[model samples]
Target: SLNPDLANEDEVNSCDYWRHCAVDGFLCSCCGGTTTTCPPGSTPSPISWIGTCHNPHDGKDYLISYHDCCGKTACGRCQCNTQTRERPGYEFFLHNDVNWCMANENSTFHCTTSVLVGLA
Candidate 1:
């Protein structure tokens, strides 16, 4: 049965790739892997890496970010929405401790390249 609130079962199942319309499309906030901070007085360039791993626990397939929850040393934690991104509240943690890279799974991990200009 279709949820009716999100999409029909066939619509959801047949989707290969749906276009993202949000500004911050599914960028995780835990490891600060998706979003970036520029130097003082510099404008933030929009960049989306496609080689990172999102929390499989989250219900939502779209990536997400959490702010003001970053740990010490100014680094942040990437957490999937246990309610929205995961299945009914499957919250988990992604540890990017600057020392050891997990390299276990990758949902959206990649090189930090600048966004191409005038492609849209």
Candidate 2:
């Protein structure tokens, strides 16, 4: 298991795993990107949950940062380019196409998606 407290913000964008210290806190790579935190005026989908990934081949962790979908506007969404030199590359989910969204300005809720990486 990876340490969320010791996770790096910069590394979160490209490392094998990331810990979203902000909203949607404490989520792994296999849980499916269902964060605990949600921006104001926004909500998470009923089917959403924290994402995680457990690869016996490579043995690594991953994180995802994105604006949850459940509203009428877009939100913040970004991905860390984490890499794992093993069977699985990485696993994660996204809230939207962009990475961030304005509070009232954006009213279109975004979709959720996850990325999976294998290890060796």
Candidate 3:
């Protein structure tokens, strides 16, 4: 069983994590990078996908900036895709399917990060 608002369940790889409801990729945490920072030798792309995720701690919907860390091969671990609120494949190009790292010089796909941009 899984709980999206369960107490003390802090697993970055869990697909039901509140913030990861809209994420898609290997977790930065498992790729030698903290949730908010890129791993060494990798670059955080400027562009990111957006998703509104709820935080049970404060009962607020937050703006999650789904960013990608590039410049290296994929992490190949902890790959998960929740896809919450993602648009249809033909509706928009900003969905998780897009390789955000394309904006970077290296363009190699790596792990992803979910950052709190602000309140939704």
Candidate 4:
């Protein structure tokens, strides 16, 4: 059997896999973003949701921070389920439901983005 944590190309296309847990918005891969880097012409938010991902390519556990890009249009793809620490209310502000790029003038939530900001 396969280790469910390991994500492949096909698995990345759907939100049913373990890697999609807590994932929301468009996949960074669809844009210019990579697993470890953000897209071009965008700034990474200082705040993010951290998770441990088992890299099938390297066979290692990596700490990945799902970050939203600031100052860009929404990628409009791969919108997945969002996880929140609480119900919809002021307390829910800490979750992925908010547009991270709203701080930037003229920027809107173009897509949900993620980047490998650390190693575990």
Candidate 5:
């Protein structure tokens, strides 16, 4: 959610949010969930991808670990496909195209979360 700081303000539901710059899925905020949590009847996939987006306020890149929530059909709302610093399949771990739910018990994906892990 990019919180605990006066400089971390952002509209959580917008696709243009700083943390969603590198994200490639629907924003959880618009899918009945908060920025860092999964909605009801869904589970956050343990395996996810990492992307970096520069925070304009601090002029520093921050790690955005996208947790694709599984256990339900895809939520069609607020879908986003950002291209910020995306790489080819050569490094699949950093790519967002792959279904992160494959590693989870229920492979159906719902929405994604852009959790701030730390500075890049």
Candidate 6:
């Protein structure tokens, strides 16, 4: 039997969930991060993808930025998707395929670090 909340809940694996607004690379949840945090000892990248996310917890929309962790190798876990918002081209800077953490030599593409910028 499926719980009502579980059935109606947004699938975390897909980008359809508001929590994944600007997410890229593998979800940190699989490793150690939560919906609004990064894994332990991981540094948040200066560059990030911005978007609006509706938080079910607070019942409000917020402007969020997805920052990838630096100083580590890729988690090699979850998949990446732009949810049809961006195309396969250089113009799509926020596209998941691009390495947003290129500036960090010790860092490799890892997990997402969700930062709430402001209320939407």
User: Could you estimate the TM-score for every candidate?
Assistant: 0.18, 0.34, 0.84, 0.60, 0.89, 0.65
lDDT of 4 by residue, 1-120 (tens): 023224465565455433444566776655666533557877766666655555555666665556667667777666677452322435444355666565655456655554554456
Tell me how many residue pairs clash in candidate 3.
0
> Looking at model 3, which ten-residue stretch has the lowest summed lDDT?
1-10
Please provide, for model 3 over 1-120, each residue's C-alpha lDDT reduced to its tens digit, 9 standing for 90 to 100: 123223343565566677877778988877887677888999998988888888876788888888899999999877888887777657454488888788899999998888877888
The candidates, ranked best first by TM-score, are 5, 3, 6, 4, 2, 1
lDDT of 3 at 81: 86
Q: What lDDT would candidate 5 get against the real structure?
A: 0.82
Best by TM-score: 5
lDDT of 3 at 85: 77
Q: Residues 1-120, candidate 5: write the lDDT tens digits.
A: 356233333466777888888778888878888788888889999888888888876788898889899989989888899878877668886888888888999998889888899999
Q: Tell me how far the alpha carbon of residue 64 in candidate 2 is from the true structure, in angstroms, after superposition.
A: 10
In Å, residue 88's CA in model 5 sits off its true spot by 1.8
Tell me the number of clashing residue pairs for each predicted model: 16, 50, 0, 3, 0, 1
Candidate 6: tens digits of C-alpha lDDT, residues 1-120: 111124332355455565566566777655566545567877677776666667776688876677788676777766556443433546555465677677666567777755667787
Top lDDT hit: 5
lDDT of each: 0.23, 0.35, 0.78, 0.56, 0.82, 0.62
2 or 3, which is superior by TM-score? 3
Which candidate do you rate higher for TM-score, 1 or 5? 5
Model 6 clash pairs? 71-107
Tens-place lDDT digits, model 1, residues 15-87: 1212111112222212333223322222232322221222233333333222211212322222222222222
**lDDT preference between candidates 5 and 6, better one:** 5
